[PDB]
């Protein structure tokens, strides 16, 4: 089940990390990969979601957890697909 390398901005820590995410897996499973990468440095970590920033021809949305990852096509305007980890509540 081969992976895809994705850059994840975490604005509340002012950091970015490139992680291998599986596209044929749920979005919650990628949220969980990001939580392990943060190594318990993010307060109230369950209240954060993966968020796709607005881009050309596409408004920004929080990604839905039930849905698979590959059902969100990456914004094609960067060498590496880009996602953000933001607070929702």
């Amino acid at each position: 089940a081969s992976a895809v390398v994705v850059r994840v901005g975490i604005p509340d820590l002012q950091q970015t990390k490139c992680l291998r995410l599986d596209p044929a897996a749920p979005v919650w499973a990628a949220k969980q990969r990001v939580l392990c990468a943060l190594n318990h440095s993010l307060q109230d970590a369950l209240n954060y979601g993966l968020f796709q920033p607005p881009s050309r021809g596409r408004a920004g949305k929080f990604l839905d957890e039930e849905r698979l990852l590959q059902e969100y096509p990456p914004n094609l305007d960067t060498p590496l697909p880009y996602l953000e980890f933001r607070y929702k509540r």
């Binding site: 002012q14 950091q15 990390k17 190594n39 440095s41």
Partner: protein, 167 residues
């Protein structure tokens, strides 16, 4: 307020990630997680001025060489880190240094040579003089022995990169 783009480079396990997290977060990552590419922003005061540091912690592999081109183009200052406990990680610094000069078409490149893990003194293979000799070879490049575990010479790495860019 100026922003400074500093790149940390060197082969795997030398402590690129541990030095960056010690500086940015004040904690020692005693685990090893392989790095693909990790950036950290942090505002510090250097020489009475407020500086935004952007620190890229890069991978120690020849994987992802496309993004290696990217970060040496845009890097303003470079920390070349070896471990004092592994001879190979030192030897492999030389090829990196020349690639930085070739993609920047100039040798006026802010640079610092770092001997990390100076807290493991009985496991030491690379002497202080070896590093001092590479440093002088390199047109009298700045040189530090550091420990990310003991927080010796950690912030000194990034602050000297900043002062060099201001120079």
């Amino acid at each position: 307020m100026r922003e400074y783009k500093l790149v940390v480079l060197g082969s795997v396990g030398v402590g690129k990630s541990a030095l960056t997290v010690q500086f940015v977060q004040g904690i020692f990552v005693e685990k090893y997680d392989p790095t693909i590419e990790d950036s950290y922003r942090k505002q510090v005061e250097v020489d009475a001025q407020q500086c935004m540091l952007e620190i890229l912690d890069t991978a120690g592999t020849e994987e992802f060489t496309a993004m290696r081109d990217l970060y040496m183009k845009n890097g303003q200052g470079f920390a070349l880190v070896y471990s004092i406990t592994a001879q190979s990680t030192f030897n492999d610094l030389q090829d990196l240094r020349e690639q930085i000069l070739r993609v920047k078409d100039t040798d006026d490149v802010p640079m610092i040579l770092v001997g990390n893990k100076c807290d493991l003194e009985d496991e030491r293979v690379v002497g202080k003089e070896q590093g001092q000799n590479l440093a002088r070879q390199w047109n009298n490049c700045a040189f530090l022995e550091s420990s990310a575990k003991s927080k010796i010479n950690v912030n000194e790495i990034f602050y000297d990169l900043v002062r060099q860019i201001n120079r």
